[PDB]
Amino acid sequence: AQNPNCNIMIFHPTKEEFNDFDKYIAYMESQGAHRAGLAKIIPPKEWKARETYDNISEILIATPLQQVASGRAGVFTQYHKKKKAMTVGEYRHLANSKKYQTPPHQNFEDLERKYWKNRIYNSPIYGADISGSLFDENTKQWNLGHLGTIQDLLEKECGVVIEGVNTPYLYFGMWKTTFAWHTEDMDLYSINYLHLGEPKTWYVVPPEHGQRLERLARELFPGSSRGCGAFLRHKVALISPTVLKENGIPFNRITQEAGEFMVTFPYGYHAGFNHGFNCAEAINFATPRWIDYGKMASQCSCGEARVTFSMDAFVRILQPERYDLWKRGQD
Ligand SMILES: O=C(O)CNC(=O)C(=O)O
Ligand SMILES: [Fe+2]
């Protein structure tokens, strides 16, 4: 067995190895990388996503979300309060203002400590799920807007043609900006590129113990657990590293810096926070190994998760039994 520890592996591909995305994902997994639930990929030194970031100020964040917490410091949910539209330029100014700027601190460990101690007391504003791409049209490798689609992957493995297309999303963050504990829709892979700015800290549970995390979340959020058999789909729940330790939940942490890719693996629960103003780009993807995870993936039918048009066909083909009930939760 490779990576028997499920530790997070960091990859440094050559120019040549960076030329075939699917090949390199398969190579990572041949080394056991998927066992951690997250891997880091450092692009080759000659690679760039694009020339500069000088001209991104006019991008509109149509619906900035203020992330308001309830609970206690290490066990809370957050809700998203919609704010008025702003440009990236305005958002960056707001991130850097006294009220929201990264505090003075020693190192990453000092910031992590301040995050879990103080996060619930503030409500930072983040620009999430903005359809779009910052990759230069001419960047040929690891261009997140040029990956093969999940619809074509499904077709190629199952021989069925389906509607839908998938496209990247941009995320503009600031200090304390928070991504709640979750796996991807249909337990897909994701890949995340940090274009610019301050770091992102990730926490991840190995896929082989995602059920343990679900069990703890049901003990920690009893009210949300009753409302829904798949409530982590709602993406509202936070549980600190200290609470995970106390509860025997295996996990790992890693900090992503600008210029680096993160890959999450099927059914790898992850959560995290941003160190300060940054911009990340992300997309889901599939490989033949995902198919079996997609067939077993849990579904919110609470209403709450309210997903995307593109998911309909995945539930339809991979989970025909679950489809009617899912479809009605969608209304
Ligand atoms: O933009 C972010 O940092 C949030 N991303 C993810 O959860 C992901 O790519 O899986
Ligand atoms: Fe994610």
Curated annotation (Swiss-Prot):
2-oxoglutarate binds at Y126, N192, K200, K235. It is found in: Nucleus. Residues 8-50 form the JmjN domain. Ubiquitinated via 'Lys-63'-linked ubiquitin chains. Deubiquitinated by USP14 with the help of TRIM14 leading to stabilization. GO terms for cellular component: blood microparticle; chromatin; nucleoplasm; nucleus; pericentric heterochromatin; site of double-strand break. Signal peptide: none annotated. Keywords: ADP-ribosylation, Chromatin regulator, Dioxygenase, Iron, Metal-binding, Nucleus, Oxidoreductase, Transcription, Transcription regulation, Ubl conjugation, Zinc. The modification PolyADP-ribosyl glutamic acid is found at E16, E17. It is an enzyme of class 1 (oxidoreductase). Binds 1 Fe(2+) ion per subunit. Zn(2+) binds at C228, H234, C300, C302. Its EC number is 1.14.11.66. Residues 136-302 form the JmjC domain. One of its GO terms (biological process) is positive regulation of double-strand break repair via nonhomologous end joining. One of its GO terms (molecular function) is chromatin DNA binding. Fe cation binds at H182, E184, H270. Its cofactor is Fe(2+). Belongs to the JHDM3 histone demethylase family. Histone demethylase that specifically demethylates 'Lys-9' of histone H3, thereby playing a central role in histone code. Does not demethylate histone H3 'Lys-4', H3 'Lys-27', H3 'Lys-36' nor H4 'Lys-20'. Demethylates both di- and trimethylated H3 'Lys-9' residue, while it has no activity on monomethylated residues. Demethylation of Lys residue generates formaldehyde and succinate. This is Lysine-specific demethylase 4D. It comes from Homo sapiens (Human). The lineage of its organism: Eukaryota, Metazoa, Chordata, Craniata, Vertebrata. The gene is KDM4D. The chain holds residues 11 to 341 of 523 of the full protein.
